[PDB]
Amino acid sequence: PSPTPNLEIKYTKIFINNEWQNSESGRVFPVYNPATGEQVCEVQEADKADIDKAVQAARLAFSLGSVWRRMDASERGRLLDKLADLVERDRAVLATMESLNGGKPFLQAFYVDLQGVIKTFRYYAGWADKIHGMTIPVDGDYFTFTRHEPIGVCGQIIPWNFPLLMFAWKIAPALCCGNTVVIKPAEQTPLSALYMGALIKEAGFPPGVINILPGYGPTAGAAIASHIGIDKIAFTGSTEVGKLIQEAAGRSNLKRVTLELGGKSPNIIFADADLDYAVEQAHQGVFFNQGQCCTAGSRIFVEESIYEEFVRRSVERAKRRVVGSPFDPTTEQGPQIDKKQYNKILELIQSGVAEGAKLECGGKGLGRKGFFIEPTVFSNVTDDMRIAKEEIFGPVQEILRFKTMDEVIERANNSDFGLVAAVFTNDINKALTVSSAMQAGTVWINCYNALNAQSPFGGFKMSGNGREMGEFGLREYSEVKTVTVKIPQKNS
Amino acid sequence: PSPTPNLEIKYTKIFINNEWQNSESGRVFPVYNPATGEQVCEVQEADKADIDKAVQAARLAFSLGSVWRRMDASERGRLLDKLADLVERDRAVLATMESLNGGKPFLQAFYVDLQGVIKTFRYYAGWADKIHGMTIPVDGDYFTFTRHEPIGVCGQIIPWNFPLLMFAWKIAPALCCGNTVVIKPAEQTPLSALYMGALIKEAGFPPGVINILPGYGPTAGAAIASHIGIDKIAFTGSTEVGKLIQEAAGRSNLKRVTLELGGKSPNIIFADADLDYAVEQAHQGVFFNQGQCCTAGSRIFVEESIYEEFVRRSVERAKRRVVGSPFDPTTEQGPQIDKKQYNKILELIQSGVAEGAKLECGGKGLGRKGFFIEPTVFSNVTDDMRIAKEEIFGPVQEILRFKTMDEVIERANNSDFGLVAAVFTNDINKALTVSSAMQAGTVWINCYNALNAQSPFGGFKMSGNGREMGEFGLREYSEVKTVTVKIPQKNS
Amino acid sequence: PSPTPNLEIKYTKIFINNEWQNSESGRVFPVYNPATGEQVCEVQEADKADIDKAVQAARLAFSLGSVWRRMDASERGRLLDKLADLVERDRAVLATMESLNGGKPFLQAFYVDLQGVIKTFRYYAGWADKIHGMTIPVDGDYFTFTRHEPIGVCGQIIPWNFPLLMFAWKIAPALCCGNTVVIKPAEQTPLSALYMGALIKEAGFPPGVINILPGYGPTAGAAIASHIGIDKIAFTGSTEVGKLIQEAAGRSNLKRVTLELGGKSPNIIFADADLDYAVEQAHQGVFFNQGQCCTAGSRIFVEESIYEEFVRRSVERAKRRVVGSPFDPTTEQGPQIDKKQYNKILELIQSGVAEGAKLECGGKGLGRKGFFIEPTVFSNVTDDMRIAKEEIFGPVQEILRFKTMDEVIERANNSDFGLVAAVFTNDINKALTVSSAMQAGTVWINCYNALNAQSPFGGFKMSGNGREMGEFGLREYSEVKTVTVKIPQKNS
Amino acid sequence: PSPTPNLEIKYTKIFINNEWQNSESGRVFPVYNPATGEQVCEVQEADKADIDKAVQAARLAFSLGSVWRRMDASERGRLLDKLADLVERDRAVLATMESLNGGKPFLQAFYVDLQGVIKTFRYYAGWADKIHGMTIPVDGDYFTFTRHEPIGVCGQIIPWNFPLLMFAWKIAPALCCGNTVVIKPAEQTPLSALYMGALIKEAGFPPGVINILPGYGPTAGAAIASHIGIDKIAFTGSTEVGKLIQEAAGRSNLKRVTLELGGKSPNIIFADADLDYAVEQAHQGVFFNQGQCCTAGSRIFVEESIYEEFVRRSVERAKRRVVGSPFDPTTEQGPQIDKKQYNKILELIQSGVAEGAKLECGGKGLGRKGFFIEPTVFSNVTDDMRIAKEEIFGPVQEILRFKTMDEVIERANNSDFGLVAAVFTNDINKALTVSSAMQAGTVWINCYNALNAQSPFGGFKMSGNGREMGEFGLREYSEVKTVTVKIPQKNS
Ligand SMILES: NC(=O)c1ccc[n+]([C@@H]2O[C@H](COP(=O)([O-])OP(=O)(O)OC[C@H]3O[C@@H](n4cnc5c(N)ncnc54)[C@H](O)[C@@H]3O)[C@@H](O)[C@H]2O)c1
Ligand SMILES: CCOc1ccsc1C(=O)N1CCN(c2ccc([N+](=O)[O-])c(N3CCCC3)c2)CC1
The missing domain is CATH 3.40.309.10 (Aldehyde Dehydrogenase; Chain A, domain 2)
Structure with missing residues (x-):
């Protein structure tokens, strides 16, 4: 492959309810090419008011009886594999964006990042209709089983070093489990995530299932962390900001938190x-x-x-x-x-x-x-x-x-x-x-940097809280509900 | 059965490293009979200073090469089985204590609470050598497996309404998974927990594995929740204080948090x-x-x-x-x-x-x-x-x-x-x-309050984070390590 | 949709090693349209000698370092995905074959049978890289884990009432687990199975991975049951022949046997x-x-x-x-x-x-x-x-x-x-x-005939041995190997 | 530890329905000391008539509503735990018996064999209330779950080389899952099996849950294998007899077979x-x-x-x-x-x-x-x-x-x-x-031969079918039932 000649930047607005919207404030922010210093484009800058619209759309997308909740789990999976097909089709465009925006050498973005993006989506396409609860041989005359339900609206915040890959690591397990997503990419690198919005509608995800809000951390990010209508936050970034996320979650909503933080x-x-x-x-x-x-x-x-x-x-x-x-x-x-x-x-x-x-x-x-x-x-x-x-x-x-x-x-x-x-x-x-x-x-x-979607990933000590990827990573995107039923006699 | 007549309150001291201790301040605090208002006894009041040496005891008990770390997982289970046998032996004294101190009808404390204590310990005794990781068929020339290891020192804070039962619900899975524990029972109701220190000693738990620190919330509790040497905190459970726990977690060392909070x-x-x-x-x-x-x-x-x-x-x-x-x-x-x-x-x-x-x-x-x-x-x-x-x-x-x-x-x-x-x-x-x-x-x-040991329990929304009991209660007390090994060729 | 009008039955030979072959004897058998009595075509009639060539093809394709053994598990899933893509493309042709050969109403063969086939392949395509072993907290200074490997050459015998769906139900879990397959469709209805051979070649499956041998029961069928080079047999049919299958397995090489038998x-x-x-x-x-x-x-x-x-x-x-x-x-x-x-x-x-x-x-x-x-x-x-x-x-x-x-x-x-x-x-x-x-x-x-790839299915008593479909179905197509490593010290 | 000096053989009768019976024919067979050739004692010889009585005791004990079917899963664990306490108590006697009857060095039987017996029972005591089914997210408006019931009457045949241990390996998983047991020890070494009958009765097992029939291969063993009232056969022994067992199970009632058949x-x-x-x-x-x-x-x-x-x-x-x-x-x-x-x-x-x-x-x-x-x-x-x-x-x-x-x-x-x-x-x-x-x-x-209760164990090829021990050992002792409920709407 070779970079897309004269790459057109056509998606620069906020993505809410499968529609492109302006800033509520009117403000935009610049995106730069770190190889040359030039400004690539201007992106609509999300703030608190835009987050509230995104949360409203994600909450309505998650309402009982909605298209996303009624959908067969196996059909969530095919939606995720369809996204993989579209990313494969638009591979060279996306690797050109990650190269132009992130400074990644193009061939690495093509053969490393984008390959992992497509593999992540295809992996979680397989999981959607294989998330199981259990039935339990409980004491007394009861029939007890668990259901693994989606949590609800998941707020997600990612850094700039692997923009497209991070995006996929976040939304793929969330969607596989049936959640809806408010995701704020890094302000340094919003472009690939926004392009993913176009593919996400083209694939046919119901409106509001994924909402992409580009903007800054202390504004859009902190609005996500403190929002009372968000059920869960998955944050990847620095350890000090991760401390702020956990503080904001306890002070506001007691929302569930996954942290993926720094290393040495x-x-x-x-x-x-x-x-x-x-x-x-x-x-x-x-x-x-x-x-x-x-x-x-x-x-x-x-x-x-x-x-x-x-x-x-x-x-x-x-x-x-x-x-x-x-x-x-x-x-x-x-x-x-x-x-x-x-x-x-x-x-x-x-x-x-x-x-x-x-x-x-x-x-x-x-x-x-x-x-x-x-x-x-x-x-x-x-x-x-x-x-x-x-x-x-x-x-x-x-x-x-x-x-x-x-x-x-x-x-x-x-x-x-x-x-x-x-x-x-x-x-x-x-x-x-x-x-x-x-x-x-x-x-x-006897190896290094062997990361994939099949294997749990996360930190000990102050390197994070919880795990992403693999069968373990799905646990952070569902709630366990025990249903216990009184029965006449019970045998077995 | 009937209440133990006179009932001596033998155990009123702080339990650290399998030794009974005075508070570092020398302070005691009273315990009352809720049915008469009378003072049942005085108990050594732990503060920040006693928390410090409890964490020190628990950390040393958790260090590599220690007796507790080297123990066969199955022998971790055996200690939990011996502890349940000791509870069953002294079941009348403990039911009298839960009745005298917590105001529970003695027959209810004997047939409900104390039965739920013995069964909790016996359930988790069986889980100790059945905590499995997995082996994963990842892409490429790799052998990937996961280990489940103990998180480390677990700080545990419980309320007053089911003293002995919550004490079991908290220490049993933590010990089943190999952790060490610093647990603070409710200031109203420390007596059952302190008696357990005696039975924990008689059963043969290594010194420092379990430390029981009676005292108040703003002192002993907040020292535990902010302690930078505690790897994980489990809290139960007013929703107001639960917010302060999660905030203090992110504020200190980003310790893992499980919350079991209020309900309506x-x-x-x-x-x-x-x-x-x-x-x-x-x-x-x-x-x-x-x-x-x-x-x-x-x-x-x-x-x-x-x-x-x-x-x-x-x-x-x-x-x-x-x-x-x-x-x-x-x-x-x-x-x-x-x-x-x-x-x-x-x-x-x-x-x-x-x-x-x-x-x-x-x-x-x-x-x-x-x-x-x-x-x-x-x-x-x-x-x-x-x-x-x-x-x-x-x-x-x-x-x-x-x-x-x-x-x-x-x-x-x-x-x-x-x-x-x-x-x-x-x-x-x-x-x-x-x-x-x-x-x-x-x-x-068609039933109510069917809370078996085999089935997980926890809140949606602001009623808590994570689950207790069942197989899923174990998930809060292990850290997952992925080990990925480069291999020469790989066949299915 | 309407059936393919005058449909040529192109594929009538034996399918071994991705090649179309005549029977060793040169014998053929007639295939009839049951709504009309008239003869549809003639199919090569496999016997013991052809089963021997097929097993040899399946054994070589299963050998260590072969393409099929070294393929990533995810690539096995991709192959099963491609097969569903192709079945979907030629859906009208295959439903027409299922009507013309099995006598099912074309509408119900297009919308029920062929939907079951496409969904079965797509389901098991997702399981391929999600078959997990475990790591075991074993007594002693040891590290113990299990691998879940394919068993080897699987023989498969199916009846005539759901020819294409029985075909999918058999090869999809078997291939998902990495086995190679010798399958004998029903003498009455081999045509859709033989058509599937061509899609299998087109999809990209390595030669010898699936071998299809039409023929009669006492000849081709018994040859599979008592073949010493077949490790596992999955038989669906009458109870009387199921007894012969288990008996023949015992007399030969003690191959593993799952039986799906009669019902009242x-x-x-x-x-x-x-x-x-x-x-x-x-x-x-x-x-x-x-x-x-x-x-x-x-x-x-x-x-x-x-x-x-x-x-x-x-x-x-x-x-x-x-x-x-x-x-x-x-x-x-x-x-x-x-x-x-x-x-x-x-x-x-x-x-x-x-x-x-x-x-x-x-x-x-x-x-x-x-x-x-x-x-x-x-x-x-x-x-x-x-x-x-x-x-x-x-x-x-x-x-x-x-x-x-x-x-x-x-x-x-x-x-x-x-x-x-x-x-x-x-x-x-x-x-x-x-x-x-x-x-x-x-x-x-409050329903009937609710059957998916997702649900375990099998008989109690003389209606079967073992289970098909769902995750529990995968256990039958995998062999467990326990690996125990001596380690210098265990920390648990 | 030292051998039990005289050791009278107290238990020499057939053990059915918790009562010691004479053989229906009155015949006895001799038991020898392999170190001296001297006859040790005489033992009632079970035959077809005795197996028949043992199957109907086991069948009545397995009837819906019986004490053994209605008992809490956890309580079966307690009984297994009690049997381990009793074996532990009489460890010296049983090791002397194993040494006297089997020729094992007494210290070897005390510290190796008997430790393995005790640990086997305590391991599976833990599993009884942890056998889970699943809840499956199927297409359409359905609630699908599985229950893991006991199979029923399990006949069991073992060799003479580890008499007590293989007795424990057989009954522990079978009872843990809630089946009833008809077990025939090897003709050379029935004594420690019969002594276990005394402990089974003392431990409080319902009558007929475990029946022990000492006797010979073609007489008592073959009557077990071809009985139409036995639902599952667990056989450990030579490959030659293993062929007959699998053949007998096919010709009779299609009972489920597991085989442990030794190697090279x-x-x-x-x-x-x-x-x-x-x-x-x-x-x-x-x-x-x-x-x-x-x-x-x-x-x-x-x-x-x-x-x-x-x-x-x-x-x-x-x-x-x-x-x-x-x-x-x-x-x-x-x-x-x-x-x-x-x-x-x-x-x-x-x-x-x-x-x-x-x-x-x-x-x-x-x-x-x-x-x-x-x-x-x-x-x-x-x-x-x-x-x-x-x-x-x-x-x-x-x-x-x-x-x-x-x-x-x-x-x-x-x-x-x-x-x-x-x-x-x-x-x-x-x-x-x-x-x-x-x-x-x-x-x-780097070891040989670490066989724990936690690790699955079984053969490839003609060394056996299925697995014993660990969690996978329990799979052979449960039938899986899928229940599918029609529901009005379904929300994922
Ligand atoms: N876990 C294992 O895989 C395992 C363990 C121990 C021994 N073995 C094998 O067992 C063999 C040693 O024992 P053996 O050969 O002396 O005993 P065996 O094979 O002749 O018989 C074993 C058991 O089956 C009974 N039996 C004999 N004939 C029978 C028949 N026709 N029908 C029903 N039951 C019958 C016997 O009475 C005995 O109890 C060795 O080959 C060894 O490899 C395997
Ligand atoms: C001497 C090693 O000690 C150990 C060490 C870790 S665990 C364990 C143990 O407990 N043991 C006793 C049972 N051991 C054994 C040996 C041979 C056979 N055998 O028949 O080939 C068998 N059995 C096959 C199935 C049941 C008995 C068992 C040896 C291992």
Whole structure:
């Protein structure tokens, strides 16, 4: 494939009740291309008044007897597979939008992000008519069963690093279970989500089942979090804002909350691992998606015996990483999302140099149009450095050294975060020992960034609350109702 | 059985690391007999300082390599079985304590509460080695499985109306899953829980696995809810304080939260129901446990054609209900828990009179000592009235009337609470149409207050988050870890 | 829609390894149109030698590292999705084949049979990547999990009354689980199965994954049952042949056996039921698909109170039932499948008149071009008549009477069959007492012949071994492997 | 612990309906001590007449409304828990019985066998009230759920090699699901089964729930297998008799069959394994329980690099393995069960020598009384020798050499059996690949042989059908009934 020539941006308004609407305020906000600095377009900016209209539409779409509630579960599923067909048909357009808006290299957006988008929808198409309750051999003369009903109106808030993929991870399980959705994409990256609105009507979802409100966090986002007519909030973003979400939910509605927050994830390389493979996988674990991954392996612990050769190979690999235009096939790494993130990264890079960490390569911006940063590698990192403790969310790799398994297990878990972790070793006893010991929601053995819709994903400690994806992720999108019926005698 | 005659209150101290302790302040607080107002004893009052060393004890009990962590899961179950055996052995003393301290009729405490305590422990003893993760057929060369691990230190706060039963409902699933516990019982009712510390010790639970910290809400409770060393909090359950729990969770360390909150539950009697049976069930729905049940019971909708006869027989039965001393085997209704609850019920009765409800019987307290209230019946109650909107934790029955199944489904669901519902009818279509439409975590058909250990319990809307009991009660007490292993080839 | 007029039957060969083949012997057998007597075409006649080639094809396709074994589970589902796409496209052709070969009215074959096929494939397409093993909290220093793998070559033998739907019901769960399949359609109706072979090739299934061998029972069928290279057999047919299947499995290689066998299923009508509706449901419950249904409600028990009028409304309805050519929209009931079944009906019909039941209507053939039988109703049937103990499998409705609920449960259960049962009533206690006490694999309340891919289906007693359809159906097509790993220490 | 010095055999009668009966013929059969040949006692010999009486006791105990059908599921768990308490109490007596009757070293029977009996009952005691059906979201206006009823009367036949344990493996899941049981222990070892009858009566099981009929294969065993009043047969034993059981069940009443039929299980030692640990574990894998183990690692494959050292260490360990009296705490190996087994082992050893396998130690009987055989090791075994293909059930170790993982995968799997397998390696890729390619119901990695109550256990291919133990063991003891209710509207 190749990028869509002269990409037309035709969906820029708020999506409520399957209709495109203006701001109630009249205000719009700009969208920028992080590779060039230019302004792509203006998007209608949602605020509290627009959220209330979205919630009203989602609440009416969910009313008993409505088309969405009466629909056969198997038909919710076919609606989700139809959306997958449409995203497949419009694949190159959508990957061009994610590239133009998110700075993702186009071929990565096409073959990675968009593939996961289509697979997520097809996976949850299969689940809709396979959500089961139970019947229970209860004490006494009763017949007891549970029903797994949709919760109702689900408010969803997502960040900017995987716009289209996040969108699908949120709405696919929600819809599969029969909920209706008020979703606020990141203000940095609203474009693909809005295009998804057109596909969503084209697929034939009833009006109001999905409502897409682009806008800012403290306005549209905080309106969702505090709204009294929203039954559930799924939030993905930073840990500090996640604290605000949980506070707002208790203070307002006691709405149910899922949190997917930040990480500072350890990647543990043992000496007996394949050096070629572990170096490239730890390099991808840092630099994938411009380093803007919550799953970034940002604390690479290397066994003493190989640390020095590991540093040499990682440095060579980072020194060859092709930075440049996302539309160029050779580009490995695009720009950071915006200037605020760009500066956040460079000040962090300065912090590591000001502390005692050896800067092997990189360290500076590139000076080009946009927000490009040189692939950066620190060695001699110690656990006390800001670099080893704060989420960089940029193309900065940090290599630490360790001696014994007990040591590195302690140090990997010595963190307020616990999103993910990885171990590289051919030894089965320390593979399972380390993986069992990690306080993280996902552990990889001899791989990294293996995420899919089939597998539960979420954080330990302050990295989140609850789980997304897989059969477990469906639990957060239904309510359990126990029906107990008095019966004359009961046998079995 | 009969009450243990003199009853010594042997256990009045704080239970930390399997040792009895004085409060760090040296303060004690009194405990009263609700039927006479007399002071039963004084109990060591835990504050922030005792919470601190309880969490320290529980965290050490939870560290890798500890006796509790290394134990076979099946042997976790055995301890829960030994604990139930000890409760069954001392069943009379515990029933006397629940009666003396909580005002429950002793026979009710013996045959209902204490049976529900023994069965809770035996149910979850069996679950301990049957908590399964899964293996997932993901895309690509991967072996993906999930482990369910304990969350860690669980802080637990319970109310006063079912002291021993709620204590079991809280510690049993937590221990079944391998957690350690810091539990604060209600300041009114700490005696049953403290006796359990003695039986927890005699059963052989490792030190620090369970710590029992009597004290008050703004001190011991708020220290638990904000404690940055507690990984999960389970709360029961006024809805006002529930908001503060969830806010304090997001404000502190984003600990996982389960809430079991208030209720104002509808009971719908259709004309085609066994009238004699429905009158006695709806009467037990409001007056059971002195009306101090989250599952009342408190909005009885009766179809027009049987409304006069239903009211007539309800008033006949309330007037016959035997209020008196809990130790007396003829007593059906003991006192309310204390003066503040007594006053709240009497004020809500006044507001019912002051709004057009027909005070058919009752309305005032009984006698001069203790906190006895007459069984009170209101008919001609309408939705907008305060008594119909706010929960009266007291012996106060409110009878509304209805035509049409659709009307009463609207009126039943029109509520911020959704803990419980019941429908009485012999028609299968009515029973299933109404139970499916109810916005409540538990719907009983032709019965009321059927709360078995095998079946989950929890609220819709502002009545709580998450579920207790059943297999689903386990879900709140485990963290899910996904382990994804790269493999050479992969075949089905 | 209207049938494909003069339809060529293109596919008449044996389907092995995605190739069309002649029988080893060179023998062919005739296929007849049952509404007309005339010969439709000639089909290659498989025997033991062809079954051996097919098994060899299925075993090689199942070998480790083959395309079918290495395919992602999600891609198995996509293949099942494509098959449904194709069946939908050629829906008119396949319904026409089902009429012309099985004698079902084309309208009911287009809107019932072929909808069941498309929905079955689509359902099991979703299960493919959702078949999960478990991880087990086992005693000792061990890590234990289970894999759910395909069993291998599955032999499948199906009858003639729902040829295409039986075909889907068999291969869809088998392929969803990753097995390879040797299937033998009924000698009477191989044509839609053989057409499905061409769509299977077009859809993309690897060679050898599905092999279709038309032929007779004692030759092709017995070859499958005693083949030492087949790991599992799924047989649907008569009870007498089912005994031979289980016996042949035991004598050969102990292949796993699921049997779906005969039925003489009860249908209980209480007075407190909607006569209008219940009469039409009991009518369809025995006359649907020309009475050639294993689920046929062939023992209609009616409460004395309404026996009178039930017979009158049933007879009035049967005398109106339109018998005619399958391609005519007005036809409700086509012919029986062949002369053997035809003569079996009337012979059993004669026993009814000779044993003392009132022939209320029908009871004879039509103008003998095709095997048409006039709709027949026996009233005053007793429990010991041949008409009440033996499967008639034709348009014959037996109506008995009963007085007491306990009497009718005893009478309905007095049978060696137990495939299905139905109770019509509006009383919840009666509906639940009767359904719980029925010795039947499927109990319908206030409906009949409600069957989906989603629901487990099978016989109690001599009506079957094992279950098909739904999730429980998947268990039969999968083999459990427990893997236990020694670990250095367990933390639980 | 020490043996129960004299041990009178108290219980020698047929156990039906909780009463001890004489045989209908009056005949008794002798029970021998395998260490001395001396007769231990006489036991009533059950035959067809006795099975008939036992089936109607079990059938009446299973009737709707009986004590066993009406009892709370949880109460069945309590009874199973009581049986474990009683076995625990009489652990010394039962271990002495198992040792005296079965020849097991007393310490082995006390600490291994009896611990497994107790833990089996306590595991399934927990499952009784946790057997759930489901509620299914089907198309149309339906409420579909499933109930998991008991099947009915379950006949059960077990061998002599783990008499008490396999008794526990059979009845625990059957009773946990609520069936009634007619169980025939092996003619060699009926004593500990009969003593359990005393404990079953003492534990409070209703009469007829468990009936124990000691007797012989073709007489009492075959009458069980072909009985038309038995709904399910659970058989553990040889593949040859397993064929007859499955054949008998097809020819009689189509009862449900599960088969556990033993094997010829491969044990693969890679060069990168903990060598001394592997030598000891492969030794135990062969010589545990006098080699009379269906799990016996009878084909140990050793990588050529370490073959010579492995053989030498195996010869040393085998030559120092203490053979002697079961009651001596020094004894690791007791006698074989009887003269038939002794002779069959001695012949097979002769076959190995005649066919060129190198006999490194042992090969002859030991002494003049009892059935002791010298521990025996065969050096250079090849896959085509009779000893490499046939189950020996004796203290005979067979060591083969191999070069390549893919070679040893083929050779391990080239067999009609597939009960169990093991691999020893520290490489994670070798352990995963080999465990996934094994055609065996249980694969151990770096151990042998961990059989818990939590883990399913059964054979591939001709090693059996279905599974025992764990949660999957309960699936064979329940029928599934689908109930489908028509409902007016349905809202998803
Ligand atoms: N879980 C398992 O898979 C497992 C466990 C232990 C043993 N085994 C196998 O059992 C066999 C050892 O026992 P065995 O060969 O001495 O006993 P066996 O196969 O001859 O008989 C086993 C049981 O079946 C009874 N029996 C014998 N003939 C019968 C007949 N015609 N009809 C009905 N019942 C009959 C016997 O009385 C006995 O109780 C070994 O092959 C072993 O592999 C399998
Ligand atoms: C010595 C290992 O100890 C352990 C360790 C963890 S658990 C367990 C245990 O409890 N044991 C006792 C039953 N063990 C056994 C061995 C061989 C056979 N066998 O027949 O091949 C059988 N059985 C087959 C089905 C029932 C008995 C059982 C050995 C494992």
